[PDB]
Amino acid sequence: MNTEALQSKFFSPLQKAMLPPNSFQGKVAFITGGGTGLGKGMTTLLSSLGAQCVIASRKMDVLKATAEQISSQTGNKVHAIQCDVRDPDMVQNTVSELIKVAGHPNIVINNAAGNFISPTERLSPNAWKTITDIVLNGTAFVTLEIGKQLIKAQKGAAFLSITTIYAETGSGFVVPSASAKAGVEAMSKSLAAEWGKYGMRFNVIQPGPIKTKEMIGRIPCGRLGTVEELANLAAFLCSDYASWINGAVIKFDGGEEVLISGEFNDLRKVTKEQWDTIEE
Amino acid sequence: TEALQSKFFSPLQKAMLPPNSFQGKVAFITGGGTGLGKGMTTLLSSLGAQCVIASRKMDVLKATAEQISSQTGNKVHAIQCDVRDPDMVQNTVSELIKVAGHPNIVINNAAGNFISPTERLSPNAWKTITDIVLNGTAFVTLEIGKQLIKAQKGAAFLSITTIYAETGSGFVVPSASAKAGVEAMSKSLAAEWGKYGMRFNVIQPGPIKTTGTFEKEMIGRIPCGRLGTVEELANLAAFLCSDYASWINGAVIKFDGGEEVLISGEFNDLRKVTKEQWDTIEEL
Amino acid sequence: MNTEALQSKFFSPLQKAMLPPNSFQGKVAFITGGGTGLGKGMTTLLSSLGAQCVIASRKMDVLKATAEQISSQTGNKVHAIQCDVRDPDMVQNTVSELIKVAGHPNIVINNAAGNFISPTERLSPNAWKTITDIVLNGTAFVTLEIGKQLIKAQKGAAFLSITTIYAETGSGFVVPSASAKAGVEAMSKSLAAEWGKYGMRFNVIQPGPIKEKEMIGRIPCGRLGTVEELANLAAFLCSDYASWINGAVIKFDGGEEVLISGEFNDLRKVTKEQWDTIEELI
Amino acid sequence: NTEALQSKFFSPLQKAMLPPNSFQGKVAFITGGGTGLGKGMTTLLSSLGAQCVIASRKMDVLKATAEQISSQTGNKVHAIQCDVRDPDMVQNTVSELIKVAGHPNIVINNAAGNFISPTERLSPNAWKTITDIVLNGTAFVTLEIGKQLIKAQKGAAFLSITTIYAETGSGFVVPSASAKAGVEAMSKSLAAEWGKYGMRFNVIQPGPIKTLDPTGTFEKEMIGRIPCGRLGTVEELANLAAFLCSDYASWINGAVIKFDGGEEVLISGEFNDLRKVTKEQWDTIEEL
Ligand SMILES: NC(=O)c1ccc[n+]([C@@H]2O[C@H](COP(=O)([O-])OP(=O)(O)OC[C@H]3O[C@@H](n4cnc5c(N)ncnc54)[C@H](OP(=O)(O)O)[C@@H]3O)[C@@H](O)[C@H]2O)c1
Ligand SMILES: NC(=O)c1ccc[n+]([C@@H]2O[C@H](COP(=O)([O-])OP(=O)(O)OC[C@H]3O[C@@H](n4cnc5c(N)ncnc54)[C@H](OP(=O)(O)O)[C@@H]3O)[C@@H](O)[C@H]2O)c1
């Protein structure tokens, strides 16, 4: 059959829970940006598999509503804590409350981000600093505080930062996000090294476009990704099955990065008969 | 310092995927008779895959294939193959298609290695390694991919490289070279062969447990405070080859307890500095 | 001869100007951190080669001294402008003055930085933010503003960021620095792509230690780098000879990174005799 | 326009950059030294006073090139016929280089082969051919010279010319991508392993250099994927090469330098296809 048909058949999304039912029982997970999109799906999955989840972002209204919706769908309590990650104090309070309404985290997911798609020359210094403050410093502040607390309590945890495929390569039009996300990856590798003795491991997922256009033409897998597929990868990495996975960076992109980065991949349209002529 | 690594980095050596999730699937694994290849085969079979293993020592292949087959109640076929021979490779692919069917899961795991100063290697010692690792994976990939294209079928491919494939390393230079080539190939065919329903991923393992003072000094360079286990690696591989990972393609996953990040970080040697010593320096 | 002497003989530094005399004439160069160390060195050589340099940093005291010290050495004028790169207002005024006293820059070197060596546990959120600010945001503010000006003027420039080898790998004990430096690298790569249409190119050097014994055991070249060596590479990259080099990341480390990052490089101390033995067991 | 902005500011400086006679008394061994990039690198190193030795399969092209450069520079260029994928020829070639010129201070592994083809249409022999020339060839050359340098207690600067797709991989050039990546790994490995012997190892990753396209339009489309707005030149590359092999770079070791006009960063950045968007089009998306 055709490209699109092989792509649909052989890269069909398995959108159901992967890990053993109740595998996260007695584990507490903390998800920045847990109220929407990717953060939500990851919460929904960790909750649905038995974790006690704490979610944190700016908008309490959406945060409470998401927690409620998941809590009633899974049976397990999702707690909402209002937090702007770029504020150290709100972060300290959020860690303080996290440790009261659940206990010390076993799973830390840094997923809260901001982004502007714009020509860089149209960005103001403030627009730049904002993205940097949310992505880079916000992840640092959350990691710093939780880290400091886990050391004091002699507990360990699995940390997971969600970045993006352009974190590695750079990209025009998303410059402060590329820079801050690169910062986030370097931080993960830095702390995977530093904090092993404390029982803390640090991994990264770099997603391509998740369905939550014809970017599909740049994806070998011929479709956008799904939230549930991603959550599955996140759950695996934060699971005990992955206790030896540390300092890793996993592309979740249907092959988008390797495709666009390959010099001669712009030949993928070239037809069979054109190929016969080219070899002449 | 080690009881934190004992409890919080404790290995989970049981099967993670759901029972019979690999029913109806066929797995082909080079080096499937020993170490990691065996552990991977063991897991896939216990999850209901019809496994086919391939390497040179047929006696080990059959023993292993029989041992797993009796423990899981699913058939493990053995095929003798030197991966660096295209003709033997052709046969093997053919025999696999006849006795099991087109593979849904292809795992290149067969390797060879010298640990030696590079100046002590002959040209042939160098060429041998390149042959088994690079050309061998390529030959397996080429033929299988040609059959899958003809049959209008697709598969998940997986290559086991190493943490030094990305960095290079003295003393294992031909292996580093060939393995880097393998990673490049995977990323290349993730891009080229997506259209045929083929995806390609890579695991980079650190030291997996396969006077005893060398093991101790190695662990000193591992943040996770221990070597990996075959079972843990097997779960990562199954995941990567499972339908749960059908949007994972061109990925390169370090499975190393954090070794690469530790040794590569310029100031990581400062992990020896003591808490009281830091007080002296923080005053300066 | 032994290792140390082979290393001495074949890796000897060439600490003199490399490019043709007066090859940077008619060029203006802006260097942050250009008052001390690596930035000074790069300023000296560009000045010695005919560029009109403008250096910018916090401390006016050390800046003016340096800018005088170099101007007396080379003859060419080196201007100093007091600037904190984490302050976008001061950056805006600094760029404005740069253009008024020298003109639009042809070379832009983002070199100002700050660092702590510390267990990450002992960092306050404020200590972290400070490194992030000077390094990532500062470089972005300087780049943003000059870029905006160069686009307005329809002129182009070579940009150069000095990062470090751990920007790519991460590293414990220098964590905010690694994160910000990494951010600086992604930025260069992003802008090389975005701003090619405006005639701006973006490159990066990652230095290892530049002029202790512990490292030299981890440096295959067997010595620290020198400021004049690094300056030559900077000058090259900022010259018209490198007009087709864009988005590049050059390690200048005597091999330190490849040494430490290689799993089996810890076997470097294994002796010929032990090597004879090790092969007998395999 | 944009091309007038790029033409003015990324303008190629196609002339020697290193000081006259800076390579005097240095011997350089360049594989593929008779043609394309190898020729340009040979020409320049000779022009700067190096005793160059070039090597490749075709003695005729080799001799012609060697003579042509020797007459241009008054400096001696010797040809030695060599198939790099043949270990015994490599042995004899190195032995010949030592006798006719001396131990090399500069070694440039430039010889290559490539096929542009769908992978499915390659035979195992087509695949293996490329691996042999690019990976095994560079290795045999490096192995033998390095053995000789260690014996003699001399060091040298090694340079390997790869490609931007060696790090990323790329469809349609898969054997090359694989073999080139192996070459990069080798350079990094030997920078660590052989620094103690006075050997350093670096890599250039070139994008498209000026010398399939009957109309001229494919080259035109290629330029669109290049931030710098042109292809590179041999002379430019040769200058980067000479720099990396000069004593000025005696502290550069294990480096990998893209020379590509910014192509690799442009094609690899997820959102870079947004460069097509006009100013007005942006004036709507930001108004949302
Ligand atoms: N979806 C994709 O295709 C895609 C692609 C690549 C990468 N990603 C990555 O995936 C992650 C999740 O993104 P998404 O698509 O689900 O939605 P998103 O647009 O990134 O939403 C951001 C989330 O972070 C929270 N947030 C924003 N600012 C915050 C702050 N200052 N403090 C605390 N929380 C804050 C938001 O909640 P509040 O508004 O309540 O604060 C929101 O839930 C991000 O890291 C993103 O970079 C997504
Ligand atoms: N174990 C570790 O700590 C570790 C560390 C880093 C990387 N790895 C990687 O993990 C993979 C598995 O290796 P291992 O550790 O299980 O032990 P190993 O000794 O490397 O396994 C080699 C396997 O490959 C097969 N093989 C060798 N040459 C072959 C040839 N020419 N044709 C076909 N098959 C061939 C062998 O079977 P026959 O002898 O019967 O032919 C054997 O099963 C390797 O790719 C290795 O690079 C492992």
Ligand SMILES: NC(=O)c1ccc[n+]([C@@H]2O[C@H](COP(=O)([O-])OP(=O)(O)OC[C@H]3O[C@@H](n4cnc5c(N)ncnc54)[C@H](OP(=O)(O)O)[C@@H]3O)[C@@H](O)[C@H]2O)c1
């Ligand atoms: N030296 C090495 O061995 C080495 C190794 C690896 C990387 N590097 C990199 O090389 C570069 C050069 O550093 P260096 O060794 O010469 O000294 P450094 O201490 O790393 O750089 C400090 C310089 O930057 C200026 N600076 C600091 N904060 C500033 C601010 N907020 N605004 C404006 N300027 C500021 C300082 O001047 P003021 O005090 O007046 O502000 C000083 O001139 C740095 O980017 C560093 O990251 C150096």
Ligand SMILES: NC(=O)c1ccc[n+]([C@@H]2O[C@H](COP(=O)([O-])OP(=O)(O)OC[C@H]3O[C@@H](n4cnc5c(N)ncnc54)[C@H](OP(=O)(O)O)[C@@H]3O)[C@@H](O)[C@H]2O)c1
């Ligand atoms: N030109 C570009 O735009 C570009 C772009 C990316 C990368 N590169 C790289 O730059 C380098 C030079 O390339 P090029 O374009 O000048 O020509 P090329 O086609 O890449 O290389 C051909 C050269 O290699 C020699 N050679 C081929 N097979 C050989 C063998 N079996 N043993 C010894 N020598 C052999 C040839 O000499 P004989 O025919 O006499 O044997 C010829 O001089 C190559 O490594 C290439 O991969 C070039």
